[PDB]
Design a binder for this molecule. Structure first.
Ligand code: HEM
Length: 291
C-alpha cells in the first residue's frame, strides 16, 4: 500500500494557519466542556486514535485516509467519547471545506498541544480522503488493563521504540478517564489542561494503591485524588521504561523535544511525501500572534 501526500489545490502556509487559528479560537470559546477542562485533551486523543490504527507491515490504517468519518471506525468501542472531538471540529470543516479529513483531525491534535502550552509540533499537509472500504477494522487500538511487555509489543506495530513510547505516554497528564467511555475513572494530576511533564513526576512521587472502580476494573489510585491505568503504572515496573521516566521527570525540555518528534512521527506514519512537497509548517500560537 503506497499513500502519497497531495497538497490541497493551491493551498499554502497561510491557509492552514487560518484553520489553526479557527480551532484555537474555538478552544478558547468552548471552555466549559468536561467540567472546564475544555476540548484540548479529547482533540489530542482523537489525533492519536486516527493514527494509532496504522500497521507497519502492510501500511494499512494510519492518519492518511481520514476513515474515522466512516461508521465502522466511528463506532469502534475503543473510540467511545471521541464523538465530542468530531462534533467540535465539524463547524471548522464547514468553514474550510477544502481541507481533507485526515489533515483536519491531525491538525486539531497539533493545535490543542501548542495552545495548552506544549512544544511546537512540525505538521505536514497532504492527507487525502479514501473510500469507506479502506476503513481499518476494530481492534487495532491498545487495551488499558495490561502490562509493560504488552505496551512494548503493541507499539512495535507502529514502530515506536521505548523512548518514543514513554515520551508519547506523557500526554496522559492531560484530561481524564471517564467511566462511561472506558470503565476507568479519574484524572492523573492537577494540571490536566496545561501540557507539562507531571505524568512522570506523579508516577514517581505519589503513593499508589491498586483499587477496583465502579465498572469493576482495577486501577492505581492515590491519596491526592489521581489515578493511573495498569498500562500507565507499567512504566515504573519495567527497568528500561523506568529509567526514561526518571529522565523526563528530571528534564522538562528533553520531554518536550522528544514528545514533539514522536507525535509528528505518529501523525505521519504511512505517508509518502514527494521531494517537491513543502517543508513542515510550524504554526504560531494565538498568543504569539497577539490574537
Ligand atoms: C497503551 C497506550 C494507551 C492506552 C491503553 C490508552 C488508554 C486510554 C484510556 C482508557 C483513556 C480514557 C478514555 C476515556 O474514558 O475518556 C485514555 C485517555 C487519553 N489518552 Fe490514552 N492511551 C494510550 C496511549 C495514549 C497516547 C500515546 C496518547 C497521546 C499521544 C494518549 C492520549 C490520551 C489523552 C489526551 C486522553 C484524555 C482524553 C480525555 O480527557 O477525554 N493516549 N487513554
Amino acid at each position: 500500500l503506497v499513500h502519497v501526500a497531495s497538497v490541497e489545490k493551491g493551498r499554502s502556509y497561510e491557509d492552514f494557519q487560518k484553520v489553526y487559528n479557527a480551532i484555537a479560537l474555538k478552544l478558547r470559546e468552548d471552555d466549559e466542556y468536561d467540567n472546564y477542562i475544555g476540548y484540548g485533551p479529547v482533540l489530542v486523543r482523537l489525533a492519536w486514535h486516527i493514527s494509532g490504527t496504522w500497521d507497519k507491515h502492510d501500511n494499512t490504517g494510519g492518519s492518511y485516509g481520514g476513515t474515522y468519518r466512516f461508521k465502522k471506525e466511528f463506532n469502534d468501542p475503543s473510540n467511545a467519547g471521541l464523538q465530542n472531538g468530531f462534533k467540535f471540529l465539524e463547524p471548522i470543516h464547514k468553514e474550510f471545506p477544502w481541507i481533507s479529513s485526515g489533515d483536519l483531525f491531525s491538525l486539531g491534535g497539533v493545535t490543542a498541544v501548542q495552545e495548552m502550552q506544549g512544544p511546537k509540533i512540525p505538521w505536514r499537509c497532504g492527507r487525502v480522503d479514501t473510500p469507506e472500504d479502506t476503513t481499518p477494522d476494530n481492534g487495532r487500538l491498545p487495551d488499558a488493563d495490561k502490562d509493560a511487555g504488552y505496551v512494548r509489543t503493541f507499539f512495535q506495530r507502529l514502530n515506536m521504540n521505548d523512548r518514543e513510547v514513554v515520551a508519547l505516554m506523557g500526554a496522559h497528564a492531560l484530561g481524564k478517564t471517564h467511566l462511561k467511555n472506558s470503565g476507568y475513572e479519574g484524572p492523573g494530576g492537577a494540571a490536566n489542561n496545561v501540557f507539562t511533564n507531571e505524568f512522570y513526576l506523579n508516577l514517581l512521587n505519589e503513593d499508589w494503591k491498586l483499587e477496583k472502580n465502579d465498572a469493576n476494573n482495577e486501577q492505581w489510585d492515590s491519596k491526592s485524588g489521581y489515578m493511573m491505568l495498569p498500562t500507565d503504572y507499567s512504566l515504573i515496573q519495567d527497568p528500561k521504561y523506568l529509567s526514561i521516566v526518571k529522565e523526563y521527570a528530571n528534564d522538562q525540555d528533553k520531554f518536550f523535544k522528544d514528545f514533539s518528534k514522536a507525535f509528528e512521527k505518529l501523525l505521519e506514519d504511512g505517508i509518502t511525501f514527494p521531494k517537491d512537497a513543502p517543508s513542515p509548517f510550524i504554526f504560531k500560537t494565538l498568543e504569539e500572534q497577539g490574537l
